[PDB]
């Protein structure tokens with residue numbers, strides 16, 4: 001079966017690069033039960049704290065590559081190397097909040113501390129998968145620790161997430177301060193909603209702050225956990241809360257020799 | 272002797288650098304304000320950003336037809352194929368402009384996305400002979416071209432009352448009344464002086480939200496602008512009804528409305 005290009009950009013031009021769609025697997029058409037949006041949206045009263053005076057900000061007169069940058073020290077340190085990539089020593093299982101520089105900082109918009117706010121840079125592709133529906137894969141080699149894209153969607157409350165019957169696209173921000181908030185990319189979302197779960201993941205989510213510092217609304221950034229070959233499927237560990245829920249419905253089809261949520265794994269766990 | 276005292280007053284925040292020169296006196300680069308590319312808030316404004324309240328269009332082409340609902344909201348799309356306002360655009364009393372948004376089915380590069388696309392002409396902060404700092408064009412600018420947005424601090428009408436230095440205060444005007452104070456927070460617009468014979472006009476635009484209490488102020492050339500010309504708009508009589516007693520006008524256009532000698536004619540006739 002030929003692998004037919006079916007959308008030259010599902011992003012409709014809102015990203016820095018086009019995100020094309022292909023299907024060389026079956027006859028499913030281009031997904032369109034959703035609204036592609038590049039940044040988070042709201043559908044109820046949220047009042048994100050956008051007071052510019054509330055912003056912690058640095059006084060740097062360099063490119064903010066020094067350990068004296070206040071933005072960095074907030075982040076423990078700036079975990080970005082010279083090329084914008086997430087340092088190898090990054091506690092990539094217990095990752096701390098990253099505060100990027102903002103509009104209150106004295107530094108320039110091109111400082112070393114502005115990776116996530118600068119948008120997608122890698123060429124990605126939405127494609128049809130063998131046993132998982134749609135997915136996202138890389139069209140280039142991606143060095144470890146590179147920023148991929150942001151988990152974008154509809155900002156909703158922990159209570160609103162309890163009510164929603166379709167939790168296939170629900171990201172739990174998990175607010176330590178106050179109440180949990182969540183991102184539901186079921187009706188409004190970006191390329192991130194199409195990323196499948198891998199028991200051997202290659203991207204990780206990081207909580208990030210940029211143009212605001214309202215702690216109920218960290219933004220989710222995905223970075224490569226490893227070097228990634230061209231054509232290879234992006235996926236992150238959805239977690240064990242997702243799979244104790246969706247265990248009655250489907251099972252993991254990732255195939256990994258260390259797969260935790262395949263039908264065999266569950267049935268072998270019941271003994 | 273002209274010197275360059277800043278390579279980009281916006282610090283890379285605009286699509287193009289906005290340098291500052293002075294060949295007039297010893298005033299260094301003004302730094303008594305934070306430059307911001309986009310409006311900021313210093314208290315809770317409760318701007319309706321509910322995506323489901325956006326009026327949006329269903330076009331798939333470039334939104335150049337008359338079934339573009341976002342053009343209908345604006346009477347018509349007033350942008351020509353090159354992003355410029357049509358010659359027939361009501362310049363005295365512009366109509367509100369509703370640009371296409373993130374709820375539109377159209378693409379981000381359609382014909383109704385001028386102001387949201389940012390500064391494109393080359394502009395320069397320079398020291399004028401009499402008006403402190405001004406903003407001059409670095410290039411020929413045809414009529415209808417978007418120049419810049421009036422960016423600053425959103426404040427209420429009551430706040431604007433207790434603001435002592437009202438030399439950067441712009442009126443949106445309305446039920447509920449709000450202001451843009453560019454005094455403490457501003458973009459390059461705060462340096463555009465007043466000209467009795469203006470060559471730019473402000474237009475109220477809506478882009479990512481359609482909260483009618485917070486139009487964004489977009490400047491467009493009301494005529495062709497020659498290379499080196501200073502950008503100015505008509506502050507209006509409200510500004511000069513409180514500022515003229517302190518300082519008189521210096522535009523010097525033959526048809527000056529707030530000049531020194533133009534005050535004496537109305538004072539002598541009346």
Ligand SMILES: CCCC[C@H](NC(=O)c1cccc(Nc2ccncc2)c1)C(=O)Nc1ccc(OC2CCN(C)CC2)nc1
Nearest residue numbers: 093158161162167168169170171172205237238239241242
């Ligand atoms: C598109 C798929 C979403 C993935 C998953 N979705 C859900 O679990 C989910 C689903 C439905 C409903 C709700 N929510 C509520 C339900 C009822 N009532 C209330 C709420 C949540 C996810 O969120 N995965 C994930 C993985 C790592 C991570 O990284 C940090 C955390 C761990 N450490 C490693 C530190 C870093 N953060 C998140």
Ligand SMILES: CCCC[C@H](NC(=O)c1cccc(Nc2ccncc2)c1)C(=O)Nc1ccc(OC2CCN(C)CC2)nc1
Nearest residue numbers: 363428431432437438439440441442473505506507509510
């Ligand atoms: C440095 C730039 C000043 C601009 C000027 N500022 C002031 O005059 C001003 C000055 C001091 C104080 C306040 N304000 C408050 C005072 C007290 N308490 C509360 C507030 C306002 C301006 O806004 N000019 C303008 C011109 C046309 C226009 O276009 C439409 C509106 C009207 N029509 C004639 C055409 C359509 N819009 C705006």
Ligand SMILES: Nc1ncnc2c1ncn2[C@@H]1O[C@H](C[C@@H](N)CC[C@H](N)C(=O)O)[C@@H](O)[C@H]1O
Nearest residue numbers: 132133134168169193194195196197252253254
């Ligand atoms: N490892 C997996 N094994 C089986 N199905 C998966 C796996 N990961 C994701 N999925 C499927 O994709 C959904 C998660 C979505 N966020 C991903 C996009 C979705 N697959 C789509 O094509 O629209 C899940 O509810 C599953 O239906």
Ligand SMILES: Nc1ncnc2c1ncn2[C@@H]1O[C@H](C[C@@H](N)CC[C@H](N)C(=O)O)[C@@H](O)[C@H]1O
Nearest residue numbers: 402403404438439461462463464465520521522
């Ligand atoms: N036509 C004018 N005649 C005299 N002074 C003007 C005129 N237009 C603007 N100004 C001056 O500039 C102020 C308005 C400012 N927003 C413009 C930038 C200002 N020239 C500056 O150097 O910061 C006024 O309060 C005046 O001090």
Ligand SMILES: [Zn+2]
Nearest residue numbers: 058060064069
């Ligand atoms: Zn810094």
Ligand SMILES: [Zn+2]
Nearest residue numbers: 058071101105
């Ligand atoms: Zn900073």
Ligand SMILES: [Zn+2]
Nearest residue numbers: 064101107111
């Ligand atoms: Zn910085």
Ligand SMILES: [Zn+2]
Nearest residue numbers: 199252254259
């Ligand atoms: Zn698995």
Ligand SMILES: [Zn+2]
Nearest residue numbers: 328330334339
């Ligand atoms: Zn349209």
Ligand SMILES: [Zn+2]
Nearest residue numbers: 328341371375
């Ligand atoms: Zn539209």
Ligand SMILES: [Zn+2]
Nearest residue numbers: 334371377381
């Ligand atoms: Zn459009």
Ligand SMILES: [Zn+2]
Nearest residue numbers: 467520522527
């Ligand atoms: Zn004058």
